[model samples]
Target chain A: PVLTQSPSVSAAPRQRVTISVSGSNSNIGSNTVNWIQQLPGRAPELLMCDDDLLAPGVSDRFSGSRSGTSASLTISGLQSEDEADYYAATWDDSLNGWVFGGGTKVTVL
Target chain B: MFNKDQQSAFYEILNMPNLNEAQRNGFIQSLKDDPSQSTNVLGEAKKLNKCQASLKSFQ
Candidate 1:
């Protein structure tokens, strides 16, 4: 569990896909993790973080979950617009910087 | 991390309005061509995973 997860591929209207993260090491120096949004052709935007520090511009439905070295992004009231890719990002003291997973794509069904 | 003061400047770079609609469209298209911004479109995905260590949160 090196703070990583496999890339998930699915068809349109994805079914409440759950993006998972796993890390073997964690000082929890920040003790917080978050998610960011990167649409098909735009840079990433802060989606959610800190278990409850939701960005002002963002909807409250989006939630973050963390246990040990793992974290997840759960999107409720899904929409076609949510089809874009999602990423999990965090900073580690030992590694001395920010880290992100490959990202997950939500395809419409 | 960019100080709160310079945050807008960095966003200005990322969302540079200097680029007209056409230009922004082109840039975005380029990203779709290479989601990971890698030499190969397929490699782009891997590139994203590799750089996870440096992509700090904006806020």
Candidate 2:
């Protein structure tokens, strides 16, 4: 199954932006959705998973949801530090592997 | 820059069960084949480790 996401998204500091990830049925429709964040020069971290759980110490300003084959990651009160790349990941049973979406760059403009 | 420790840690990170075995081997071999790419990724891993260490302060 294939996954797709925006190339980039942006908002001024303290504003809000949402990145959406959509994939084919074999991937997203039946599996849990995961989101990872990658700051510049940093190893990626799991920011959200299963479309419901936020990692400990992560702010509630980040929210996730899934509808149909699409998942959402909403960043509220975005800060300059939030300017990074967001990638969506999921397990695909058909492929017997995990697939990642093309990352979306968040720009704090 | 993969010192022995970085290489070991990266191996631990990538060899986890949830990741497909082929994928794990793919990344490990790919990184080894290209030292510069491994250096770049491992550099970020250092930051991750350091940041996780600092997270203990709030405890």
Candidate 3:
């Protein structure tokens, strides 16, 4: 399972940048991949899963849709609180468990 | 950081399709050990190849 590195965004402080979690031959073609939120020293939380399924209490606006093994997590309403790291997790058929893409740094852009 | 409620929620999330028990446990334990070494290489799990190994034997 090879993961492509995300491009570093150099946007101005406090702007929105959309990040996509793309993969190949995933378990869920259109709505399988799951996303999680993890800060530098905080436990990871289920942010979005299966396209638009948000964990209980997660704001609806923060979740998003799927494309192939890919899904997007949009921080529409971006804020400094949103700063930290984000991760994409999905069930890997071959592996028999979840596969996680390497951490993505959400630069304060 | 799952409390009583959050843990219950994930317990349901655990039953989703193609979700393997040993594999999921392995992944979470590994992540708790270190984020820098995380991977989906479940094949390597059989040989204790990477990340944290299960503690069943140790216990």
Candidate 4:
């Protein structure tokens, strides 16, 4: 019922990067996931939800997918502005509510 | 237990541009479905909002 994410990732400008989230069976197996993008000093933006539902204006480059107990978010064309914190979220039956990832920071190098 | 003003405030937070359309609707529906069992989403959403470090300049 816990959700975890990689602490950080670094990539160069225009390069591709991936942020990964892992969860137990209850959270990732039975339930789906939502991805949040948070730029510094800004509110959380719903990048994608239910694994692949991209929010309006969000680029297809920020694709999301899941396999078994792990979920991934890939940024195909990374930009300098893409640097920020990304979180994975889902409902957990054991917790009886929503749980969030620790967040992954993508640093554009 | 939210009054008119409180209800409006809640909706205002969830109505922001950053939220997923379906997720916002889902959160609203959850409140309507079972207010007692819900409210967790609002807290996290609030956390995503309101900067805790903003007041540091005052120190």
What DockQ does each listed candidate score? 0.06, 0.03, 0.04, 0.04
DockQ of 1: 0.06
Per-prediction fnat: 0.09, 0.00, 0.00, 0.00
Candidate 3, residue A25: the lDDT equals 77
Expressed as tens digits, the lDDT of each residue in A1-109 for candidate 1 is 2257547656545345667776646523345676778888887766664644554346766777777767777776667778777777776777776666777887665
User: TM-scores of the first chain across all predictions?
Assistant: 0.82, 0.95, 0.80, 0.95
lDDT of 4 by residue, B1-59 (tens): 35453475467656655444664665566566656545554654443332111111111
Best by the TM-score measure = 4
Candidate 2 residue-wise lDDT, B1-59, digit = tens: 26675476467646344443543455566567776577654444443333333223211
Which should have the higher TM-score, number 2 or number 4?
A: 4
Compute the lDDT for candidate 3: 0.53
**Clash count of each predicted structure:** 11, 1, 0, 0
lDDT of 2 by residue, A57-85 (tens): 47899999988888999999999999888
Candidate 1 Cα misplacement greater than 4 A, ranges: A9-15, A27-30, B1-59
Error at B51, model 4, angstroms: 22
Name the candidate that leads on DockQ: 1
Q: lDDT per residue, candidate 4, A17-50, as tens digits?
A: 8888889887887776778788988877667766
Q: Show pairs that collide, candidate 4.
A: none
Error of 3 at A75 (Å): 1.1
Q: Candidate 2 regions off by >4 Å? A: B1-59
